[PDB]
Design a protein around this ligand. Structure first.
Ligand SMILES: [Zn+2]
Ligand SMILES: [Zn+2]
Ligand SMILES: [Zn+2]
Ligand SMILES: [Zn+2]
Lengths: 82, 134, 310, 311
């Protein structure tokens, strides 16, 4: 029951520590959700993982998806997101 | 053209401007809707000169110009990036995108419209705290 | 049970699902590949395309990862592997819905099994024929999916078998993104696990003991999150062997293999063995005409639960 | 569309549309700028915001191009020109919906006319008031809207006047995209056309004759395909003068000014003149509160089409 394991683990595994088993369960549940074509539920799982990774200070600890767009400026000809 | 722009007829203005025999009607900078991207893994600019040159040579040899449809800016020739994926469905994305602004994530029209209208969700569907609502 | 006719004029050899479980590809000895889609409304299997693929009998096909597009490999007995990409701007049931990409004319023998590596390893391939040579084909150039480069060439069998003696080969990758690259390769009577080393080349890692006869099917169970991996093997004997693998020169991790169970319920030859998505239900077909479903008990012993006669 | 009443407590001096014909901005003498937007539902004008801008009566206004944002420039008697930009963040009709960008406090006398250049010149602002000098302000970087540099300063009058109160300075730009830059100055009673030469400095192109009284307005005509261009001027006597301008390629082109018409149907003082976007239908204001529409006849002269009076 990796679904219940992941949905319980995201309540404070990367917020307080870091173990490989929780990341394995999270990736396995995300792959299963992709395989069932539950992309909306995968997105809800991702935003819940982002929301529950807020520390006491406020620094996010979730391994979020990296940026895919780096627009080049028309005038200065440099990266707008550095 | 300015009179057409004064009314809400922009597609007609685009049709008029696309096939105008005069080449310097609106602006002289050339391409002002052209967007250049840096790569998400190496940081170099996605210009793809090698792929365009090879596909131009191949299409010159084989005659048909459908080989040049394989050229695109969804891959990087320096870092050998395979494809850019949709933020919701994780499928290859080649022809039309819908970029979420504050976080810089891709999307099909149907996928992004589904997540931001049908599901009534105000967050980015890729795990982003910045509320890019509607 | 609802039987649907696939429409081939000869024996249907291999049937494989896609990643999303709504498309099935059937190869046969009539030199044809057929792709069937599962209709959402009518809930009946209907044909999408049917095109001639090879000049001999196709025996193994595989779907690619859905994040690399829709690519179907096809390994036939004419010493070719052909990769097929769908262009959706064609009519269905026409023969032009799946476009040819590349022919791999490097195999000197009749190919038996073709498999895609998992998506975290890239767009890789794995071919095996009666020449006894395991070949890995990558997709390095991302602009065109027609330049596939051979990268790993490992010899499984020392000499190829003669034409009068039968042979069977099968492959199974490692569906684990959190483990190093592994490959279960089934020779005639041998089962070898190949691991990717620090030098970028495959090496012999472990061998599954037993297997006094021909191995007909190999299958690596999905790692749902457990600490032990599972390999299921169906031999020419009646044995459905399940191997439990625990992972801990020039190899990133040495691995130990212990036989978990051994079942003689089929009383014949286990032609095919497979796994579920979560590795809880096994399915095994045999010469008794019955497909058995196996589930692990509380004490980690697999016991049959259903028998489906045909 | 039906007429509507503004909340202004004094005389409205200049009303100017936006580009898209849905946003209207009125500057008045009670120190208020009220901007109204045309609602899609029921086709009625609705208020956007109302903020005090200057310390005197505001006599000029001109929107900028929508590609440079919702910029409104207002000129008043306080010798300053202030630029204002809409903010969707603040609530409508709150008063904080608009924000200043730069105050053009580079004048000694009260400024009368502010006008925005055609978009192929960039973001350029024309200012003319009681000092007798035409001030041109350029945005050398259109990226930032708070930076404004004076670039051209041409003395349109020989001497400063004595009766500074009895003066009116009006400006009008030339919407020809591919002709050289042309600017119209009506300083006190003389109308001057200014063309940009090869040296990069403005020069006197041609002079409109006549104009026996103070020129209260000026408007250039959008020439859609015509080989000649039209200028509408309005004098204090009530005479509406339509000049015919022919351009043939130190300036690189000479201008031949030929008077085409002179109408005195307004028994008063023509405060404002205007063109429609075709350069055909001309409308004029007056001291009688009447609005007269003028259209070209079969001949080369113009004739009145309707007299819109207010009761
Ligand atoms: Zn820049
Ligand atoms: Zn790159
Ligand atoms: Zn998508
Ligand atoms: Zn995002």
């Amino acid at each position: 029951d990796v679904q219940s394991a992941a949905l319980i683990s995201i309540f404070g595994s990367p917020r307080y520590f870091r173990d490989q088993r929780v990341d394995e369960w999270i990736q396995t549940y995300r792959d299963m959700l992709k395989s069932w074509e539950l992309f909306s539920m995968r997105a809800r799982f991702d935003v819940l993982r982002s929301k529950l990774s807020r520390t006491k200070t406020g620094v996010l600890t979730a391994d979020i998806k990296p940026r895919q767009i780096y627009i080049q400026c028309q005038n200065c000809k440099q990266n707008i997101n550095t | 053209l300015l009179l057409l722009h004064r009314y809400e007829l922009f597609g007609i203005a685009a049709d008029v401007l696309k096939y105008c025999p005069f080449e310097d009607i609106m602006g002289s900078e050339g391409d002002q809707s052209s967007i250049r991207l840096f790569c998400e893994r190496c940081g170099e600019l996605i210009t793809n000169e090698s792929s365009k040159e090879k596909l131009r040579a191949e299409a010159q040899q084989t005659g048909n110009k459908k080989i040049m449809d394989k050229f695109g800016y969804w891959y990087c020739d320096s870092c050998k990036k395979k494809n850019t994926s949709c933020v919701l469905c994780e499928r290859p994305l080649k022809k039309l995108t819908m970029v979420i602004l504050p976080c810089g994530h891709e999307g099909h029209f149907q996928c992004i419209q589904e997540w931001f209208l049908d599901e009534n969700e105000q967050e980015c569907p890729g795990g982003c705290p910045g509320v890019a609502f509607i | 049970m609802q039987p649907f006719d696939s429409g081939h004029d000869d024996l249907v050899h291999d049937v494989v699902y896609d990643f999303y479980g709504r498309h099935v590809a059937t190869c046969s000895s009539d030199q044809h590949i057929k792709v069937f889609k599962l209709d959402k409304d009518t809930s009946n299997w209907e044909l999408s395309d049917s095109w001639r693929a090879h000049d001999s009998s196709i025996v193994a096909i595989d779907w690619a990862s859905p994040e690399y597009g829709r690519i179907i490999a096809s390994a036939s007995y004419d010493k070719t592997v052909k990769l097929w990409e769908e262009d959706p701007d064609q009519e269905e049931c026409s023969g032009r819905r799946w476009n040819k990409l590349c022919t791999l004319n490097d195999s000197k023998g009749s190919l038996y099994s073709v498999k895609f590596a998992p998506a975290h390893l890239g767009l890789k391939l794995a071919c095996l024929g009666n020449d006894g040579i395991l070949r890995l084909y990558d997709a390095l150039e991302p602009s065109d999916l027609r330049s596939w480069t051979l990268t790993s060439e490992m010899k499984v069998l020392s000499i190829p078998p003669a034409n009068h003696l039968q042979s069977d080969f099968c492959l199974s990758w490692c569906p684990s993104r959190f483990s190093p690259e592994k490959l279960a390769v089934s020779a005639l009577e041998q089962a070898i696990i190949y691991q990717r080393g620090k030098d970028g080349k495959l090496h012999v890692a472990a061998k599954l003991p037993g297997h006094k006869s021909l191995i007909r099917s190999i299958s690596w169970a999905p790692s749902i999150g457990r600490w032990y991996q599972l390999i299921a093997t169906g031999c020419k004997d009646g044995r459905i062997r399940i191997f439990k693998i625990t992972e801990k020169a020039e190899l990133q991790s040495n691995l130990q293999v212990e036989l978990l169970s051994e079942h003689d319920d089929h009383n014949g030859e286990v032609w095919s063995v497979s796994w579920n998505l979560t590795g809880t239900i096994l399915s095994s077909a045999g010469d008794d005409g019955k497909v058995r479903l196996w589930k692990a008990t509380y004490s980690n012993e697999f016991k049959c639960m259903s028998v489906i006669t045909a």
